[PDB]
Amino acid sequence: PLGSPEFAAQAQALAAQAAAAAHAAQAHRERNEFPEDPEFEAVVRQAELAIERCIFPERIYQGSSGSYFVKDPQGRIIAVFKPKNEEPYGHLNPKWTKWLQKFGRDCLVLNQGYLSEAGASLVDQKLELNIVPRTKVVYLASETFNYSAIDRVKSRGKRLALRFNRIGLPPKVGSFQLFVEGYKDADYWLRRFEAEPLPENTNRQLLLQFERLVVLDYIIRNTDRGNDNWLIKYDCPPVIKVAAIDNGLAFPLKHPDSWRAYPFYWAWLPQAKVPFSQEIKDLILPKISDPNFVKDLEEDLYELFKKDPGFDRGQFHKQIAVMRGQILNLTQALKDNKSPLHLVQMPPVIVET
Amino acid sequence: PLGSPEFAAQAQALAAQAAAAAHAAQAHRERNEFPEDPEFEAVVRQAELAIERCIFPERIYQGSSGSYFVKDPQGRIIAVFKPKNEEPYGHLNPKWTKWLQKFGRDCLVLNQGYLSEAGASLVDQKLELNIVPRTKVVYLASETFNYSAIDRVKSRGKRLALRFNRIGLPPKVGSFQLFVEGYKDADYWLRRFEAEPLPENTNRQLLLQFERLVVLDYIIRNTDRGNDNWLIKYDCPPVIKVAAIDNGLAFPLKHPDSWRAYPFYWAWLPQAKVPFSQEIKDLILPKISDPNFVKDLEEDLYELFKKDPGFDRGQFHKQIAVMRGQILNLTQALKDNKSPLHLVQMPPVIVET
Amino acid sequence: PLGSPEFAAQAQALAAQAAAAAHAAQAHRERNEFPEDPEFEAVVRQAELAIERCIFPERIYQGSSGSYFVKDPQGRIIAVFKPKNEEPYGHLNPKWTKWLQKFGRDCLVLNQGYLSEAGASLVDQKLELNIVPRTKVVYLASETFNYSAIDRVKSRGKRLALRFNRIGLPPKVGSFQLFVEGYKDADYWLRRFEAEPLPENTNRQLLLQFERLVVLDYIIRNTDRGNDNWLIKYDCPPVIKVAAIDNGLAFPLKHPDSWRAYPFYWAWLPQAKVPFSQEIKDLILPKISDPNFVKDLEEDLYELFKKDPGFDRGQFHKQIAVMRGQILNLTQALKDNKSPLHLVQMPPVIVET
Amino acid sequence: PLGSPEFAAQAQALAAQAAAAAHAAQAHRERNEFPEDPEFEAVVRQAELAIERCIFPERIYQGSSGSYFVKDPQGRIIAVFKPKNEEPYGHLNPKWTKWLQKFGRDCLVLNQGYLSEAGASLVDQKLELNIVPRTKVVYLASETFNYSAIDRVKSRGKRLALRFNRIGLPPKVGSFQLFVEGYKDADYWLRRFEAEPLPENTNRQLLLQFERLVVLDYIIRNTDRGNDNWLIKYDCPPVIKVAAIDNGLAFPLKHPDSWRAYPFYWAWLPQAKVPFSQEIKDLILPKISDPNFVKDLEEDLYELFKKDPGFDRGQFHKQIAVMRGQILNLTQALKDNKSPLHLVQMPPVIVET
Amino acid sequence: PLGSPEFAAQAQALAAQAAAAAHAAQAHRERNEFPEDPEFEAVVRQAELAIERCIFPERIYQGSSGSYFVKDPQGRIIAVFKPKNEEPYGHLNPKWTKWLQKFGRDCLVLNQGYLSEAGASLVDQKLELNIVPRTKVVYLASETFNYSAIDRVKSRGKRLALRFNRIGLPPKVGSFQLFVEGYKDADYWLRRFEAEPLPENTNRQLLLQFERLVVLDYIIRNTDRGNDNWLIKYDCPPVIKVAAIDNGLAFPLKHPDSWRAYPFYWAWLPQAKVPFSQEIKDLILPKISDPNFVKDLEEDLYELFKKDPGFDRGQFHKQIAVMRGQILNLTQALKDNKSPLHLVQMPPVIVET
């Protein structure tokens, strides 16, 4: 039926279902479905429920203006949410970037903080580090988010969607990180471990966790890690855990012009001088020294980063070339028993494919 | 010294002081000075003080999204504030209006609500009606106003102005109306005065006040007056007062295309059938039937409306021509003992100068 | 003679001499005259002489591509020269910057490295620190500088200027820093002073010099100071000196978005914990805590920065506002006997005029 | 399978391999492969090797700025290299040429010197003259070539390509001519042969070689042949050879507006008055008087000239029409025993197809 | 007071009165004042009066769509009115004409019919022919004129101008010709004078009038004169008069490309063969053969033609150059006793100044 009526009708059968698919693409996303992580999805529903019951997320007070504590219906904090459009450069949406170079000193893509934040968690899972609290790209609407004058007015009138859904403020895409309880700024503890040293067993545990922090921040080439930016939880009577929490400024697209800019602040710690353990070597080497893993990782990141209205395939290859070079350095340092300090001293490399 | 060095230096003496004047024009305005109404200025300082002490204005809950209850340092409400840029059409700032007609059905200027609001009070004062609570154009900055992502971030860092003023969020221009206490929606009372009629003396007082409402709304050709939009205060053991409160949609630039659109809802009330009193006649006629008063009024409005970044001298003349025609009708109705109802039935007139 | 022939001829007398002045503006500059520093001028002539005798400046081998060792006619190094147009972003000359924001994460002006470099020396002199080797804006032409294909060809033919000057390659504007002899990377010594501590008197001298480094880098808010970027000279049988040498990335126009970015690497040294001395206090406070000095400094920088084809008065005020805030912090820390470490911990401030 | 899944997968099998082909087109070229001339390829590898070992090509001192002596790893000169982008008009790359006429006096294409240079050698081979030293289009990267500021900086960081190739400065396309040893400027010898005449046998040999020069320069309508521009090698105890070396200004697209412009300087020599030999007639006539040879030649040149980013099919036909007219004149002169002098006196002809 | 306050106030005294003058320029014109012809003005008032009393001008039925019979308040016809904007090419008002040639076959200016019509009458008066009924440029508003949808709607609402004038439909500029009574198409009579010849005295009178028609049409180079286009009035018991009535297609800006195009249809009449009389010679020669008269005429036309929004000084000089050439021919023919027929046979001349 290459030129038949039967086929002409088959082609319209596809044309109308493909046009319906594209109409229902925004609502499908905003449904926040995670077949792969039912546990994360449940948290999101708790967040949605709380909002219907008018227990809203609240701005983090001394934080940057664009991040909120998501609460459950009981008032407990359950997540940190950071909307894309409330990021520093969350304006200038009409891609202007291609007119700009057809630059520059800046080495991060303009408005993809939430993606960096989500990418970190992704890298974490694939590497099995379990230090970044599960964070994913989520849509949420709430009175307390920063909307424009028009959005706020346009949302007064009663609106229904047609399965008769009420519509309020538009949902915001953002990163949604599981909230972890009882941690403090890493430096608070590290200086306390300077007066009281820890028992050796606990200290061995701290270092094991620290190595995972180092691996994560190095592969994603985090741009903004201080010693207040990662967290340690220690309860005396005896576990110690680190959480990597603020990962919105990673995945750069080139190494910084100056090597002095954007240091990894954990490199000045004494912990950084301790050679990589055997444990970290056989958790990480079987992975990063296999092209298929790195291929698979790169495809995963591609999937995640595609989401963005401003995604640029050119930029993405630059991002992956940087990360490839980081993986390469890490492999060597892992093989030759180097320490985190030696690792950060290796010269930046780019690997083009 | 027509071409001398003495004059050349005199000319630079003016050129640098004129350039300083223009640099300091925004800070001068944002200082909110009212030599003419020291009482109003004091209220504003109370509002500024409360904000420094972190008692912020709060959104009016069931109102439109862009209006706030300004509180004093004790928590009492002292004003209603409505920022220009939080009005419905408070975007599209780059005047695009001239490219648009070089249209249309719309009969109000795009983003001058606060000016209408302030103009009402101005007309009120000049006419000596005392029904609009004193409202003026004021600048205010506060955490609870709707700022953009960038403004909120840009304001984290410590900024000083050089007399070392701290700088937080940018001040917003808006209308600042004195808050009046113990009124209810006009219809709440009017229907209660339908079961209980009032004692005749009080009723005479209500009508006297009502006539002033009618005069005000007619001269400014209010577009949006319901019987919930004006307020009556009545305390039994015996005064009755009206307040005209929501005047953001007045001063149109042409009469509505249809006469049925935008009625004055008070015209359906029985009160509207009562002929104008003598009292209102000799309060209003000595004024509006004298070209100098109307000239002086027009100059005052010009002064106030100039303030706006988008002010258009063309539009302004259209606004004044409408108001001139309203004044003209009002004069006749005032002379011939017509009622508010007859007045609103007269045909719309425009008076071009 | 306000409309006379005498004046008409006087006006043409000015019009032709003003047009000659503008023709001869480039040649006047390229003459490299320094009435204020005859000693510096002499060095420049030695540099010019060496070039005529075909002893050329040579690229600094492991340095960035745009810097040269200027040699005298005997082959000794006498200066470091860094051409404007060989800086990283030394292309994109047609100011495009105003079309770009009418952005961004970048906090340095695009192509003014040589100006930062010269500004450092300027600040140094005015403050009387004597740690930056005298560096100024100089023009030089040489075979070994990076010219374009056209410049190189266009310069084959014999060209004379009319006082019959030969013309070769076009002179390049750049920064010209006096070369200092016998220093090493600051970290080379600092780690040697970790094994051998110094005699206390010498150590007191090191610290005195260090404080001057701290003052300089803080006021110009250097963006790129490591502990390899400044130099210490120590000859045992007993003086010790610091030189501040690589100052091309200073004078930013806003504080960095993240406080973690661009640290002052000397803040992690133990020397940084030592409270400011009395000596530094009465060298620096009588100066920076007097508005006229700061006014005079700001005018000097204005003079220097004007030179640039891309100078922007808007950017310049941003640069001065940052530096004003740095001065302000420094003053406090100087008054309250704080250390360099405490100083760098103070929050970034901007001071707008 | 005209609309099958099998074919849809076959079509994607081609679409991805065609997209890979286009990605790997630049690296394929820069690999400098010459299956047809293994001997030339070997020289190129020697050149590449020398560069890795840091024995760089060096600018020809009294030559034009864009030509280099390529050295082998032992320091012997092995080639002359002339980069495209270092030619006089090697800027203005964004084809502007079509906007210019939709002109002019100029009769050479803008930036195809290296192509003229390579085309000469091509014509030489096909004609079997063996006077142009084998020259081809080659890519080379080297510190000593004229790169831009950005290229030089961008190349500091370590870059790998993925078969893990290091990347330094970008390779430059250019012409790569085999270096020939022991020749002098043709005029040096010709004036020496004016005092000492040569033995008749050697002189017969010189003339035989000269005729080949004449044939070559005439068919490619060289624009820039002096008597210093071609070379003679003569070693007394007895061979004599000519080399045609500087062929970057040939293959014009129209005859010069004036016949007096661009002469062939060898036409004023006495040698030019000697009638064409029989030897040259039966080497050249069986070739140029056969449409298939001329068709085949034209296709070869097309192949070579296509390479260029700025190739224009319009210009190319103009180039071939000129050369066709030259071939036509040459044929006549060859048939009628004319001399080089008579040949150059014939009127310029164009032959359009 | 060359730079005094007295003069600064004098300059504002002029600036405000000059701005008032320009505001009141349209209303001044639309007042239709004719101090020079009080008799014509009176007719216009009768026309205005009739319109107020709702006796409207009516479209001329078999005429072109843009002409009306103006009636007095009694219903008698008193004028013919032809609005500018109801002419054939009365659209395309935004001068596009200059973009068009920076053409063409067309030899009349685009939209100046009413001006031609008024110019004819002007030429008539100055020449003292008295055959064109007094026609001038007049403004009139009426329901029966062709207005646009918007004008018709915009005029429903009551509008006043401030001396409280009512405003209805906008006045139209047009030509206003006095209506003459009892004429017929010239050909109706001419063919009747072919059967009945006239008494010789009357015939002498006809010819005298005819000569004046010829003079008029020739000097203005009428483009559209048939023998139905001019009128003869003859009442038997004995005067005969001609009226020249339809003069909207005159004053061309170049002679027609073909001499056969646009003939003067009266040239085929036998009357045209009669030599010019003495009477016409001493009425017309003392005038047109004197440069001052022709200068004065040209200035008058300039005055009249300036009125038009689309007036072009370039076109006007072309119009005058044609008319100068016509005057020149006419003079000769007048001097040498030629007839109208010989006159029209003379070759077209242009006279440039």
Ligand SMILES: Nc1ncnc2c1ncn2[C@@H]1O[C@H](COP(=O)(O)OP(=O)(O)O)[C@@H](O)[C@H]1O
């Ligand atoms: N997943 C998390 N669980 C618990 N606490 C968190 C988490 N993420 C952030 N926080 C805490 O809340 C604050 C959030 O700030 P951060 O994540 O740095 O973003 P921002 O600086 O943009 O506000 C931090 O001070 C940190 O102590």
Ligand SMILES: Nc1ncnc2c1ncn2[C@@H]1O[C@H](COP(=O)(O)OP(=O)(O)O)[C@@H](O)[C@H]1O
């Ligand atoms: N000056 C005032 N004094 C006291 N109450 C006021 C005043 N202005 C408004 N209100 C009350 O607060 C609410 C403010 O809403 P309104 O002024 O209509 O603006 P919006 O509808 O934009 O919120 C009204 O419901 C009214 O009852």
Ligand SMILES: Nc1ncnc2c1ncn2[C@@H]1O[C@H](COP(=O)(O)OP(=O)(O)O)[C@@H](O)[C@H]1O
């Ligand atoms: N004024 C100076 N006197 C002596 N040595 C210098 C001077 N300036 C720089 N140097 C030395 O030469 C090198 C120049 O590099 P630097 O000034 O950092 O610029 P870049 O990094 O752009 O080459 C440094 O390694 C430093 O050791």
Ligand SMILES: Nc1ncnc2c1ncn2[C@@H]1O[C@H](COP(=O)(O)OP(=O)(O)O)[C@@H](O)[C@H]1O
């Ligand atoms: N293939 C070659 N073999 C040997 N010497 C050459 C060759 N090509 C050029 N030369 C010599 O080196 C110089 C190169 O200059 P030339 O080829 O004319 O180009 P340019 O004039 O652009 O430098 C010439 O003076 C010539 O003597």
Ligand SMILES: Nc1ncnc2c1ncn2[C@@H]1O[C@H](COP(=O)(O)OP(=O)(O)O)[C@@H](O)[C@H]1O
């Ligand atoms: N001034 C006038 N007096 C009397 N009748 C006139 C006058 N002008 C025109 N007419 C008559 O009315 C008609 C008007 O048409 P005309 O003037 O030719 O313009 P159009 O052809 O554009 O309608 C003519 O047929 C003519 O007979």
